[PDB]
């Protein structure tokens, strides 16, 4: 079959030349014969295209010696309840030039913080992938009205990821040697993590013997929560999906069974607050 990961969201009807298609599936039909492809002299390459590639559908189930696993068990999340940060993302739909994927618009954390990003996506060109702004619109939701003014109010992602590392480091330096993002229906939150998470083997901070929790592209160095000023990437974060613990309804209906002091103000941080709060009640009562 097929997957939705790296789905081509452009509105071009054809495309593309065998030398430019990343996969056999995306080769234009003219070049396909009997499970293979043929070169056709006279049908030239495309040297102007811009093709939005969807980042929905990530699967974190690698089993590689020495690379920690992002998604952890309930029991290991309990041992690290000090590292728990709720996280939720409201998105916007790609539009005009492309259709079929969503982009991070407002990122919420159980710290109370909300960060608004410029709609940015991954666009394939004849040369590379251009991480760049794209046309986007708020979801048709009537309840998504509050997102309308956010569209002209986001920051560039190189700032956004800085403030994330910056907020997690101030919140967690005296609490944990890691972060555990606590999520509900992790799909789009994991997609948002592509914009600010890097993974690899375990490392140690350049200024201490502590575990590395951050990474800097500008310097190719690693840092703990204490020594992370200027760093732009969260490194080897952990996470868990509360929703997968056998709950039936939506987030609020399950949160409200144990808590009456977190009314729904419909913001990303409100969902993030309710997700962590639900996890605490579910995991430390009976």
């Amino acid at each position: 079959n097929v997957t939705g990961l790296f789905k081509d969201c452009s509105k071009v009807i054809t495309g593309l030349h065998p030398t430019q298609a990343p996969t056999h599936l995306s080769v234009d039909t003219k070049f396909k014969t009997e499970g293979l492809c043929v070169d056709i002299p006279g049908i030239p390459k495309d040297m102007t295209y811009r093709r939005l590639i969807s980042m929905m559908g990530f699967k974190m189930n690698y089993q590689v010696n020495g690379y920690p696993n992002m998604f952890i068990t309930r029991e290991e999340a309990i041992r690290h309840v000090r590292a728990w940060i709720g996280f939720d993302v409201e998105g916007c739909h790609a539009t005009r030039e492309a259709v079929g994927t969503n982009l991070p618009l407002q990122l919420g954390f159980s710290t109370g913080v909300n960060l608004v990003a410029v709609p940015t996506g991954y666009v394939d060109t004849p040369n590379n992938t251009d991480f760049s702004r794209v046309s986007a619109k708020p979801p048709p939701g009537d309840q998504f009205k509050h997102l309308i003014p956010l569209m002209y109010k986001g920051l560039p992602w190189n700032v956004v990821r800085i403030k994330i590392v910056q907020m997690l480091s101030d919140t967690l330096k005296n609490l944990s040697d890691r972060v555990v993002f606590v999520l509900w229906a992790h799909g789009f939150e994991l997609t948002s993590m592509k914009y600010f998470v890097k993974i690899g083997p375990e490392r140690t901070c350049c200024l201490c013997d502590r575990r590395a929790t951050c990474f800097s592209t500008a310097s190719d160095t690693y840092a703990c929560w204490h020594h992370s000023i200027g760093f732009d990437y969260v490194y080897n974060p952990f996470m868990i999906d509360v929703q997968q613990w056998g709950f039936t309804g939506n987030l609020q209906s399950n949160h409200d069974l144990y808590c009456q002091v977190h009314g729904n103000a419909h913001v990303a941080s409100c969902d993030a607050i309710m997700t962590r709060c639900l996890a605490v009640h579910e995991c430390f009562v009976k």
Binding site: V2, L5, T19, T23, K59, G200
Partner: protein, 131 residues
């Protein structure tokens, strides 16, 4: 809406390398712990009467090679991440890559590990005869 590009068999490795600080090392390490190579490449039906050269504008496989669309060989292209060049451009996209038939099971891994002789245009170790 949209047109699918990938298959479920590639989700694990493409997701792993899409997040890695060092994608090239991630893919080699992934292969070293038994992961299957990236599939769904662009394999060419060609005459196999070509010059046998490594990177070409039309398919050039000889009788000991397979030809592939070059972007489907570019790891950086397959994961939609930055290219390791200072100018950020791909050397394989827009070309055809010739791969030894014995290594045709893993075209992406081959080009990560191997290098092309700039004098004769042949892969070092797999065609280059240069003194």
């Amino acid at each position: 809406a949209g047109n699918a590009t990938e298959v479920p068999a590639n989700s694990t490795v493409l997701s792993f390398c899409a997040f890695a600080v060092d994608a090239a090392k991630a893919y080699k390490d992934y292969l070293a712990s038994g992961g299957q190579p990236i599939t769904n490449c662009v394999k060419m039906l060609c005459t196999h009467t070509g010059t046998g050269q490594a990177i070409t504008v039309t398919p050039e496989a000889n009788m000991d090679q397979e030809s592939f669309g070059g972007a489907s060989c570019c790891l950086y292209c397959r994961c939609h991440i930055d290219h390791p060049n200072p100018k950020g451009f791909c050397d394989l996209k827009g070309k055809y890559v010739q791969i030894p038939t014995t290594c045709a099971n893993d075209p992406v891994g081959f080009t990560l590990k191997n290098t092309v002789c700039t004098v004769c245009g042949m892969w070092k170790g797999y065609g280059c005869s240069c003194d």
